[PDB]
Each structure stands twice: as structure tokens, then as C-alpha cells.
Design a protein around this ligand. Structure first.
Ligand SMILES: Cc1ccn(-c2cc(Cl)ccc2[C@@H](Oc2cc(-c3ccc(C[C@H](N)C(=O)O)cc3)nc(N)n2)C(F)(F)F)n1
Ligand SMILES: [Fe+3]
Length: 275
């Protein structure tokens, strides 16, 4: 029989809640905000602390040094749009509500604040309705270069700029749409393909390797590592790519290169029929 899946955007209420002293209370605070959030609510505006803003400022400042030579053209295209409309600055952390409103005008995507990791099924189910579950907290100040879990920096600098791109927006949703009510095996295959594209993908533009992986675009160290030449590279092929192990708390052992977003989209459409 078919497992439960959302049939409308508001149904995501039923799946979004899955799962240093001052930092812990701060983290619980953000978790509480996401937990009590219901569809239709404005995403609660948060006054970030200076340490959090300085952390964002450090990551943001350093990544912007790398983006022109590392990021794909679409990322570099939409990133200034975010700084002109959503307050992307070194001294200011953008609000999830504002960028969500921006995405609505651009690609119809929206943001939903989430406490932490959701199951791949629940997360991909959100994409089916062009909803991206975002963490609202900032990474610990100890290591701004890399963090073993998503933070608001990862969402805002990694995911948001490409979600504003129609071709990429379509690609993301179709992965989500494919996931709806799919078998456990199918969801995991889709989740792995999502992982090595949306989160850690590489693309070929004008003969050059560029980064569109969100997990890469928000990590100072791995972004450099991905294009250094010391990394393992393979062509994106869903049947093969979906068999690759997804690593956490570390750099990936291999990266997959797509020809383009529409190319990645077409390869996925072919693949989802097989499963
Ligand atoms: C098959 C499949 C697909 C997904 N999953 C899965 C399921 C659950 Cl419930 C938990 C964990 C995972 C996967 O882990 C991650 C991690 C991240 C991630 C991205 C960026 C950053 C910040 C960056 N390092 C920075 O420094 O900015 C952090 C984390 N993103 C995703 N989508 N998955 C895992 F475990 F498979 F790898 N499984
Ligand atoms: Fe992510």
C-alpha cells in the first residue's frame, strides 16, 4: 500500500516536525519557533545576536571572494538580486520571511522554518509543492568554514540563490514530485540524486567546472576543495549517481558533474520512470 504523502501545500504541517550553555538555549529557541509554525503563518522575524551576525559576516565575506571563480553563472546572476531586495549584507542576516516572499515572486518557491533534519521523504515532499524547509539558526562561531549540519547560512547562501532560478526551481520540484508516495527504495535513490546535484553538484559551463551544490556554496573550505583538482569527479548519471554513499561531517569523496540544470532535469525524468 501507499504511505501517506501531502496532497496540498498546507498538508506539510503534518510532516515538518520530525527529528556551551548559551548556545543550547539559543538552539532550542529556534527549534521552538519552527515547531510551532503552521502553513500560512508569516515566518517569525528573528533578532540575531552580534556573534551570530559576525559569524554570518565572516562566512558571507569570504565566500563572496570565491563565488566569481567557483559559482555557476546562475548563482552569480541571482545573488545580487538577493542583496538588493532581501538585505544580504556582512552586517545583516536576511530574514527567512523576506527571502521566502522573494522566491514567491521569482519561482513560486516558499520557505518553511524547520527545527532540524527531516526524513528524505518528508523533505522531498515539500519540494513537490515548491516549499523548501530551512533552518533558522546560525552555525557555532568555532568553525565558520564548515559545519556538520545545515544552518541559516547554508540555506540563505547555498540554496536560496538557485531556487530563484526557474530552470533550477523546476528541477527541484520534479525531484519532489517524483518522491510523492514513492517506494522507500525510490525515495532514497531520489534523495541521493538530490544530494549530488542540489546539495553537492558540479556543472560544466563554457568548458569550466562550476559549483551549484548548496552544501558546497555555503562552505568556504569545501568550495575550494571541490574545484581544487584534488577531488574525484564523475559525470552525473542517475542510475550510477544514486548508488553513491552520502557522507556527513566530512567532505564528499566524489562529485558529480551535470551538463546543465535542464540536462540534470531530463536525466532525472528518464530515471524516475525506471523506479
Ligand atoms: C540518501 C539521503 C539523502 C539525504 N539523506 C539524509 C537524511 C537525514 Cl534524516 C539526515 C541526513 C541526510 C544526509 O546528510 C545531509 C547533509 C546535508 C548538509 C548540507 C550542507 C551542510 C552545511 C555545509 N557543510 C557547510 O559547511 O556550510 C550540512 C549538511 N544535506 C543533506 N540534504 N543531507 C546524508 F546522511 F545522507 F548524508 N539521506
Ligand atoms: Fe541543504
Amino acid at each position: 500500500s501507499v504511505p501517506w504523502f501531502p496532497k496540498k501545500i498546507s498538508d506539510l504541517d503534518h510532516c515538518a516536525n520530525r527529528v556551551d550553555n548559551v548556545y543550547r538555549k539559543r538552539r532550542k529557541y529556534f527549534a521552538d519557533l519552527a515547531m510551532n509554525y503552521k502553513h500560512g503563518d508569516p515566518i517569525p522575524k528573528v533578532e540575531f545576536t552580534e556573534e551570530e551576525i559576525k559569524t554570518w559576516g565572516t562566512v558571507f565575506q569570504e565566500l563572496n571572494k570565491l563565488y566569481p571563480t567557483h559559482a555557476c553563472r546562475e548563482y552569480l546572476k541571482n545573488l545580487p538580486l538577493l542583496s538588493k531586495y532581501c538585505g544580504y549584507r556582512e552586517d545583516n542576516i536576511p530574514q527567512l520571511e523576506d527571502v521566502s516572499n522573494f522566491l514567491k515572486e521569482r519561482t513560486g518557491f516558499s520557505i518553511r522554518p524547520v527545527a532540524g533534519y527531516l526524513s528524505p521523504r518528508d523533505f522531498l515532499s515539500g519540494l513537490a509543492f515548491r516549499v523548501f524547509h530551512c533552518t533558522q539558526y546560525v552555525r557555532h562561531s568555532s568553525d565558520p568554514f564548515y559545519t556538520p549540519e545545515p544552518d541559516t547560512c547554508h540555506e540563505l547562501l547555498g540554496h536560496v540563490p538557485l531556487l530563484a532560478e526557474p530552470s533550477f526551481a523546476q528541477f527541484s520540484q520534479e525531484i519532489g514530485l517524483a518522491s510523492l508516495g514513492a517506494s522507500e527504495e525510490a525515495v532514497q535513490k531520489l534523495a541521493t540524486c538530490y544530494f549530488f546535484t542540489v546539495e553537492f553538484g558540479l556543472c560544466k559551463q563554457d568548458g569550466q567546472l562550476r559549483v551549484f551544490g548548496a552544501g558546497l556554496l555555503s562552505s568556504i573550505s569545501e568550495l575550494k576543495h571541490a574545484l581544487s583538482g584534488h577531488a574525484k569527479v564523475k559525470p552525473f548519471d542517475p542510475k550510477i549517481t544514486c548508488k553513491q554513499e552520502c557522507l556527513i561531517t566530512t567532505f564528499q569523496d566524489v562529485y558529480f558533474v551535470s551538463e546543465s540544470f535542464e540536462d540534470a532535469k531530463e536525466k532525472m525524468r528518464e530515471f524516475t520512470k525506471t523506479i
